[PDB]
């Protein structure tokens, strides 16, 4: 007995909804112009709907201006309401963000994990979770690693927590020649150890989960090689999470 | 609603447009969401002519809101000495209490409005009045290192 | 601040004619729309050519009545897109007005309302004129009111219901239709002035001295009393200057929003004092709804005088009645009688059986005795629904039988709501 | 599906007693057979759910009454989370109450364990 | 709700049908050529209802009836296309009219019905005149009704069905035919005026003192009744204006839609009357069972709903008083659980040859007496199984008779239930 996708429900189109005074309001110098412009389409145009139009709808003009703010916009509020827009698209339009869409917002989002305001990290991470659950691990696996290597302490801990989030919901079943194994020891492990051996404890402690969520996926015997090279003292922290963690 | 426009004006402080709205018979004691009359709002933000205009048109000088705040509370909190004496002259409740147990004397003492403290005191403020936690205006001066206020409270 | 009026069914439409006839005489507006002469533009808009058009929609599921509008004295006054007609009427069936026929035209009607609301800048709300017992008046209105609570939800809506009366009653099922609309229109109406056609009949037989009144007779009397209530909105008085104030002054409970209107004086065309007319406001014979306020508690009370009136005479007549009668109020009321005056004289129609009076008054009072009127409908309803009589007509036009009971419980609950306030 | 797909258009006919009836007939080709060996069930569910709003607001008492039965026979097989997302929301509140009252009186697993009637190939199987 | 399509089927159908067109053509001021020679706007205000020329379709398996209509007075006015006639006759066999011969022709009729409906601004419904003891008027009429009911389900179906009586034809199969036809009407029509030949004879014989009434004599009473009940429909007026509103305020339970009509004053064929009756006199021809067109005693049952139509110039004040009087002075005869169940309407244009008149349409439970008579005659006939081979030979099943018998008895029981009902 197979199940249904409830997604069969007819789709809705939002392109006609946008107003003429939208592009200039988002591309304005006055912060409240931008905020209201974004906030309007979120509360009026996206939040109501429950399924966007798959057929013949190009959002990669709208999505690249959400990225422009999420990355560069100095107003943390305009970021927050934008990443919640990005999530809504990726959520109400599942199976759309194959590359052009997903990749247009991916590396901007990972840059902005730098934000430490709880509400904002909430919105950015949850949107990263959206682009992941419908594009995992297309571009994110590689680019997530890149930003674990980044200089800002916050982006390290948050992009590593991201790999942890993704890894718990990592999916089967090809052969064991998925993108995770092709780059497992070469890249994933070499980069997770950089987190495990960070100067900060709160950083290191994210690596300890992100390594014990890794062993859970790919066998505590396969990775016993870099386990030995690790401190006996760090080892029992890694094992601590291994015993609690589920994927 | 004409009672809601009179709140917008009395708050933001457009002295002239109060007279316009009141000449259209607006409710002088119109309540907003949280029970705040225009007299509350003008007394918070220091619009002396708007206070005296509303009072002489029959504004409830001792009106409370959803939290038991009278306009004299809010004037003594923010520190509007001009308005405090206008309210008191129009029969304000010098020893009014709000939901947290504070009197206007509590708020003027906490915010360091020594000039308003003395005015309230001379209108028969309760110096020994306590709040929820059990603290008087005198305890606040002891707790807040304000020897200038301790002397003004025992005068 | 431009109020839009809506007229549903023959009752609304034909009372509408009487009111806009009377509005145009009070404002010196011509049948062709011109004016040789602001506060009155609450109700009328203006053409570039100096023509004053009502802010009104006329609706009927059948041409006949609205056809006479647009081939009559005031055919030029309305834009033709304002007068909307279907073809099959509701046939005294709320179900057809609300479900079967009403859904075929509701969207056209809501669209034509948007065109009048788009011309308006600071729209206040809606005045709605309709019968109770009529199928269109009950069913379609209640539908339109539901949809106006969506498309204009954040603003006021006022009812002018025609309470049914066997002396002019066209249908057996008018109790059903009354209950059904009052249930579904209860949540969507902010205030509602009932008009008992029996009282208007009684008044016209006694004070206008007519043996068998016609509908024209009833309208002239009703339109006079409607004008008295809307005078504050059309001439910029002091009291009830906008639609919110009606709820502020008269409605101290969302559900209990049914004021009793009393109008004096009604003088045949074949002068009284300020005191004499104010005493007649507490005489049941001149009420618009037949009940006994002496058996009930007042939640509020407004007096709308108009004409040759001295503000001191009013205060004397008030003190007289506040001292020399026992008008019981509820304890949680401001027990102050609100007043407003408009010095312009009551206009009558040239030819009317109603005479021009020097001064006049219309007392709006939310008394609990108006529950008596709901009891009379509820009883008639109960007798027929006990046998499920005529119910197949409704159920066969898209209506669930349960809706009858859900409505009856809402009327029983309303009768309890009136009781608990008055004890 | 092929039988269902052919007799669906008749729901949109003038005569009520025909749509009254052939909604009863649709509902009992389901309660006795059911959806099995159906290529694209999603496409089929959409095609038979599409008219159910209008049918449930149809003038005829019978057309309505016999549409709540067809609703139940779809719930009786994969309801109610799905039908409340797709169809319960749109019906009169009184209606969706009766449908819930109808689901309580229903006992037995969410998809029926055994069909009251089997197909051609299925019976020998 | 404007136009009404009229149908007449069978001999009786076209007889009382043509008589009806004679009466209301005069009343509306139309001549046999089809031209207005009236003198009042109250006449052409709602002429669009029955006319375009009548909106009338003429039907019979008996081809002779064709000529009996056209050779009549207003026979020239009817549209030639709207005559639809068979080769042979049904010969008092309901099955021949409903299943065999009448069914073969019914398509041709529906084609004309469609044609006349096609060019209607807004149809109200239909109007069929026919007899129930016949083969064509009953069998093909009821089959026509169902065939329209399913082709036009958003419309009213209104019949003037005349009941057979031994006093007018000694044919014993009529109880069969009328029972089978009532089994149809209770399921297929919104309202049915029960014209009883038993009562038409008893009025022509006893009240009008005619020793041998002819069809023409009975048809005079009918045509005058029909113009009376259709007065609301044909002239401007507030109350009971269109067919649906009438049925809404007349029929509280779908199966109990058989009205007992009656009107006043009862006149002979072209006789002279004294001083126009007074309003209280007219009013006192309601319970007066000698004015009922159905052979039933209103005293023996209860009125569910009543419609009164007063025609002529008179005091609206006095009519209201007299009707409000007669209701409460006989309060035990009007059902209590339907308040304001009696409705009165006035039309200023009186009928032809009378200064005042009053028609009394009533849904009285006493009508069960009528269905009792038909059923007892049916059962007496059916228990001995007489003449069944006629019906069965035409494809009918013996079971049908049992179902129609039982279904009419359920109809009688229902009337008896609401008669004994209480408000308490
Ligand atoms: N006072 C007054 N009452 C009226 C007027 N017109 C109708 N009524 C009353 O309204 C009630 C219902 O009649 P209508 O309003 O005409 O019915 P409707 O709204 O047109 O609905 P349908 O005709 O069934 O489609 C009746 O009881 C009448 O007595 C009027 O012009 N003035
Ligand atoms: N009142 C009246 N009754 C008739 C007339 N002609 C026939 N009947 C009755 O109708 C029944 C016979 O049916 P009929 O209409 O003649 O047969 P059809 O031609 O097959 O419909 C008997 O009960 C007759 O008494 C008529 O002109 N007037
Ligand atoms: Mg009407
Ligand atoms: Mg014949």
Residue numbers in the entry:
A (entry chain E): 297 to 543
B (entry chain G): 13 to 167
C (entry chain H): 2 to 38, 47 to 279, 285 to 437
D (entry chain L): 135 to 259
E (entry chain I): 1 to 42, 45 to 54, 62 to 360, 369 to 441
What's the paper's own text on this?
The XMAP215/Stu2/Alp14 MT polymerases are among the best-studied families of MT regulators. They localize to the extreme tips of MT plus-ends and accelerate αβ-tubulin polymerization in eukaryotes. MT polymerases recruit αβ-tubulins via arrays of conserved tumor overexpressed gene (TOG) domains (herein termed TOG arrays), which are critical for their function.
Using crystals with either a native sk-Alp14-monomer or an sk-Alp14-monomer with a modified TOG1-TOG2 linker sequence (termed sk-Alp14-monomer-SL), we determined X-ray structures for 1:2:2 TOG1-TOG2 array:αβ-tubulin:DRP from complexes using sk-Alp14-monomer and sk-Alp14-monomer-SL using molecular replacement at 4.4 Å and 3.6 Å resolution, respectively. The X-ray structures revealed that each TOG square is a dimer of TOG1-TOG2 array subunits assembled head-to-tail from alternating TOG1 and TOG2 domains. TOG domains were aligned along their narrow edges, analogous to four links attached head-to-tail forming an asymmetric square-like complex with two edges slightly longer than their orthogonal edges. Two contact sites, which we term interfaces 1 and 2, stabilize the TOG square. Interface 1 packs a 668 Å2 surface area and positions the TOG1 C-terminus at 90° to a 10-residue segment of the TOG1-TOG2 linker and the N-terminus of TOG2. Interface 2 packs a 290 Å2 surface area and positions the TOG2 C-terminus at 90° to the N-terminus of TOG1. The total buried surface area stabilizing two sets of interfaces 1 and 2 in a TOG square is 1930 Å2, which is moderate in size and dispersed for such a large assembly. This finding suggests that this conformation may be meta-stable and that DRP binding and its inhibition of αβ-tubulin polymerization may stabilize this intermediate.
